[PDB]
Structures are given as structure tokens and as C-alpha cells.
């Protein structure tokens, strides 16, 4: 994800699924290489104490002036026409300057944004369309016309560009937490399981205090936890042995 030679374009942003693996968010977050590392429903310090249901990394390049648009609820041509985060986004936005990775003395032009769209796009959608955009009241047909535009525009990343007009690589990590059977975790080692005694338990990052008993409840395969009428957990499925 973070060291791949070439990123996807912000108009056609890539998405990788992260599953069946141990994350170490300390190795990421304690790095000096990141200019932005902002989380939206968790603190980056706590990512090591959690297990995650599904995780996706979204990878793309933008201009340093535009990294401000990747926060949820923002607006402007990036947040309106090619990459929107949802208002209730949970995850982390991670970004760094690419002026030795994505930038060329003759101009690098491999990266494009979307300048025009009949509507603003919905959260986590992507538009691949190369349709000509009718900015005027007239329709048009064929490849070009007056007030008809190609909808994409290329960034001109040159190392002579000032900071803000330089490229920035962005990764967005876009997980969900403590609600469903988990598949990606921090590096925490399990203990043995003990029953009929009062203990400080932690199941997939669900920390609590109580006594554990073998339940006669019949969970379905998609259920990791059971809740009380007070919306507190009152049963769990052990992630080591599925009782």
C-alpha cells in the first residue's frame, strides 16, 4: 500500500481489501514520514488494542492544497467530483508529500482529477466515465465543441512547483469496529480462557469486567456478540474456539 511504485489517480482511486492478518498501527503511526495521519472514530494510539471486521485501504494522488478536501464533510472539486468520505466516516486519512515520487522536471502528467460532473458523487463512489461534459445550454455530439469539455484534467507535477502545487500521496483506511466477527487485529497475544471467576475480559477489543459462563444461546455465523436491553454485551463467541 504505502511504498508501491505508482499510485492510482484521484479520479479512479484504488481500493485494497485487508483481511486475515495482523496490523501494527504503531509501525505506521510512529513513522516521521506522514504529514497528515487523522483518524475519525478512534484515536491512532488505540488502533493496536482493537480488532476490525473489514478493512479497506483507498490509494490516490492529489495536490498539497487539496489534502484538506479528504476530511469528511468537506467540499470543492475533489470532495464533490471524485472522492467523498461519508459524514459519519470511521477510519484514518494518511498523507505525505511526493515531490520525489510523483513529480518530473518535464512535468509528470500520469495523474488526473475530474473537473466536471452533472451531480456531486455519493460517499466512496468512483466515476470512470470519459463522456464529454455539456457546460452550455446546447447539447453536443462527437469528441469536442464550444462549451463542451473533456471531464478530466491532468495535474502537471514538476519539482519546480511550490509546496501546495506538489503531489501528495493519500491512503485512507476505512474499517468498522466492535460490532461483527473480526478478521484484522492489532498485535495483542491471547491469554488462556477462564470460566466461573470474575475477570477483566477483552474479546476482539471488547474490554469489560464480569464472570464467563458456557451459554446455551444459539448464535448465527454472522453474530459475534449478544446484547442486553440496556445495549450492553451479555454474550460473546470466543474467537479462538467458537463457543
Amino acid at each position, epitope marked *: 500500500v504505502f511504498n508501491a*511504485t*505508482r499510485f492510482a489517480s484521484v479520479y479512479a482511486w484504488n481500493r485494497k481489501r485487508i483481511s486475515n492478518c495482523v496490523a501494527d498501527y504503531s509501525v505506521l503511526y510512529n513513522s516521521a514520514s506522514f504529514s497528515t495521519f487523522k483518524c475519525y472514530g478512534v484515536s491512532p494510539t488505540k488502533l493496536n488494542d482493537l480488532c476490525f471486521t473489514n478493512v479497506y485501504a483507498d490509494s490516490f494522488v492529489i495536490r498539497g492544497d487539496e489534502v484538506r478536501q479528504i476530511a469528511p464533510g468537506q467540499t470543492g472539486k475533489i470532495a464533490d467530483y471524485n472522492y467523498k468520505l461519508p459524514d459519519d466516516f470511521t477510519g484514518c486519512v494518511i498523507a505525505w508529500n511526493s515531490n520525489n515520487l*510523483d513529480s*518530473k522536471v*518535464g512535468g*509528470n502528467y*500520469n495523474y488526473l482529477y475530474r473537473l466536471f460532473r452533472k451531480s456531486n458523487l455519493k460517499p466512496f463512489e468512483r466515476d470512470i466515465s470519459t463522456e464529454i461534459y455539456q457546460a452550455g445550454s446546447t447539447p453536443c455530439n462527437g469528441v469536442e465543441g464550444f462549451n463542451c469539455y473533456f471531464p478530466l484534467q491532468s495535474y502537471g507535477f514538476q519539482p519546480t512547483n511550490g509546496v501546495g502545487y506538489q503531489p501528495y500521496r493519500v491512503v485512507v483506511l476505512s474499517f468498522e469496529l466492535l460490532h461483527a466477527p473480526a478478521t484484522v487485529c492489532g498485535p495483542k497475544k491471547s491469554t488462556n480462557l477462564v470460566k466461573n471467576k470474575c475477570v477483566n475480559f477483552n474479546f476482539n477489543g471488547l474490554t469489560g469486567t464480569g464472570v464467563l459462563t458456557e451459554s446455551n444461546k444459539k448464535f448465527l455465523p454472522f453474530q459475534q456478540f449478544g446484547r442486553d436491553i440496556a445495549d450492553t454485551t451479555d454474550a460473546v463467541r470466543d474467537p479462538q474456539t467458537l463457543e
Partner: antibody
Amino acid sequence: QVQLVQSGAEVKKPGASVKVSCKASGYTFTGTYIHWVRQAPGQGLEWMGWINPNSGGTNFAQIFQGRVTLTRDTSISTAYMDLNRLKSDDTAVYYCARDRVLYGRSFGWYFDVWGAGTTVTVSS
Amino acid sequence: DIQMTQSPSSLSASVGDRVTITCQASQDISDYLNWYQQQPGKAPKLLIYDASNLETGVPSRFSGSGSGTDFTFTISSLQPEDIGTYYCQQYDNLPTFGGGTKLEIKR
């Protein structure tokens, strides 16, 4: 572990055509470009062109434009060169090589893994 | 087009000696240049990328330097496994190759 496997050696008449394949394995085929490159007997290296397996788009070294065609099937993770109207001097060792998965630039070609290669021999 | 020419066509070098090879461009490449080793009977292998970054697992003896139109590659102490032809290739406009430098053991 990753591998590129070429077909066995090819022998052809002048003016004929040859199709050579690289079967990829051990990595995701659409991640990076495949180049084709050759070497004449006891001589230096000579680039043909590249293909982007995610898109099928391809770019050539000038001299080979309108002579070589590059193609690929994504299900079978195989990149091909099909070369038209073979000159006697197209007698060479041929290779394909991958476009650097990590630590490069966005542009830069490199050649980060190469297959064992194959010989094309041209004679009347 | 951009030409790449290597000044030494071949070199005779003893075990433990320092070896230097030069790649000369026709045009200012900044640092858009890579270096390869080809051993007899095998495909080439990438040694230095970006004119001065060493690739993973490569022996520390291999080195590269310079910027602009002109570049060096270096072996700080040659040993018998290093024997083969060394090539530059650029990337400012198409991957054009240089002519290559052969290495032989001095005797």
C-alpha cells in the same frame, strides 16, 4: 516468490511472423507493466515496447511500431508479443520483464524481474 | 531520441580491486537512469535504480553516483561472481539502453 516463463525457442523464415508468450505467476498480473526486450548474438540490449496488463494499452520504441503488437489475457496471466515480417537480423534472444512493484517513481520503467528468455532464429 | 554511450567497452580487473564504469547521455537526464549486470548465459539483473539507490539483497560493494548528463557505476572490490556485462538504461523518455561494459578477471 514470482516467476515469468517463456515458450521454447522459435525458428522462422524471413518475412514470416512469430508469437512469443510470457506466463506470469506468484503475483497479481494487473499491478505493473510488462516490457519486451531483446539481445542480438554477443551484442547489447534493445527494447521493443511495453504493455499495461490492467488496460491493454501499449507503447513502442519507434523502429518496432507497426511491426510488433503486444497483447494479454488476464484470466491466464500471460503477456504476448506478436511480431510481423521477420528480418534475418531479428535473429536474437528475447525476454520480457516487469515494471517494479515497490520503491520506484510513478514513471521509470526499471526491469525488476526477468524471465529466462527465448531464442528467435530467422533463416531461408 | 536520447542516446546512452558507455565509455569503457571492456575492463580487466583483479580480485579486490576497484572497478568504475561511466554512462554518458546525449541529453540532461537529471537522475532518470538505472544500472544492470548480465552474467554469461543468464538474463540481466537490476543493481542500482534512480542513478544512486542500491536494490534489495545486492552486495554492499556495488555503488552509483552523479546527476545531470553523466553517471558512474562502481564496484569497490571486484570478486569472481561479478563477471559479466554491465549496462545503463534511462527513463526521461522511453527506456533506451546503453552499449554495455564487459568485465574480465586480470591475470
